[PDB]
């Protein structure tokens, strides 16, 4: 039932994506909120994934500099984004480290996605924040909440996040 909890989603790469276990990515809302589903290489398998939601976790758009996410919340509890992130661009470890920011909270700065998947897979960062009383607690950090959960991701060597397939659900990382 990840569907019925499932606030928001985005995999930047594709095009409104259902993944089977409901989880609708929103068509490219973030670059002009424009979608324009980019696949080109669906020849290259994500691996962990199933088809479908294999091009929810494989299809990347146009790198190019910081570009965030607006997750409007209104509430509270645990919110758990789970981002599925795929590179397969330049073979290198620990140079091409991207930033990962939840509502400006830098969890993963220094993702390098071919150190941690190595061969062309899927790599998952599960990030659960708890907001009480109107303030947002990522991990270890915590500052109050401000209007939206606002994921930004900037660019380390050249790329940042390239393919993005932000899925925030609420309540549990359980």
């Given at each position: 039932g990840l569907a019925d909890k499932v606030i928001w989603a985005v995999n930047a790469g594709g095009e409104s994506h259902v993944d089977v276990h409901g989880i609708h990515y929103r068509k490219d809302p973030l670059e002009g909120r424009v979608g324009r589903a980019s696949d080109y290489g669906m020849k290259l398998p994500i691996l962990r994934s199933n088809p479908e939601d294999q091009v929810l976790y494989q299809t990347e758009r146009y790198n190019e500099d910081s570009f965030g996410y607006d997750i409007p919340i209104k509430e509270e509890g645990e919110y758990v984004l789970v981002l599925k992130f795929a590179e397969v661009y330049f073979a290198q470890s620990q140079q091409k480290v991207f930033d990962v920011r939840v509502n400006g909270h830098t969890v993963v700065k220094d993702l390098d996605i071919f150190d941690r998947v190595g061969h062309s897979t899927a790599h998952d960062e599960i990030?659960?924040?708890?907001?009480?009383?109107?303030?947002?607690?990522?991990?270890?950090?915590?500052?109050?909440?401000?209007?939206?959960?606002?994921?930004?991701?900037?660019?380390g060597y050249y790329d940042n996040p390239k393919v993005c397939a932000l899925f925030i659900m609420k309540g549990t990382a359980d």
């Amino acid at each position: 039932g990840l569907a019925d909890k499932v606030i928001w989603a985005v995999n930047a790469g594709g095009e409104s994506h259902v993944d089977v276990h409901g989880i609708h990515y929103r068509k490219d809302p973030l670059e002009g909120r424009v979608g324009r589903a980019s696949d080109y290489g669906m020849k290259l398998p994500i691996l962990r994934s199933n088809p479908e939601d294999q091009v929810l976790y494989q299809t990347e758009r146009y790198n190019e500099d910081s570009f965030g996410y607006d997750i409007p919340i209104k509430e509270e509890g645990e919110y758990v984004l789970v981002l599925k992130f795929a590179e397969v661009y330049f073979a290198q470890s620990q140079q091409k480290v991207f930033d990962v920011r939840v509502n400006g909270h830098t969890v993963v700065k220094d993702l390098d996605i071919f150190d941690r998947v190595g061969h062309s897979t899927a790599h998952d960062e599960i990030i659960p924040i708890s907001i009480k009383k109107g303030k947002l607690s990522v991990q270890g950090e915590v500052s109050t909440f401000t209007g939206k959960l606002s994921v930004e991701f900037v660019k380390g060597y050249y790329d940042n996040p390239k393919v993005c397939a932000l899925f925030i659900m609420k309540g549990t990382a359980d």
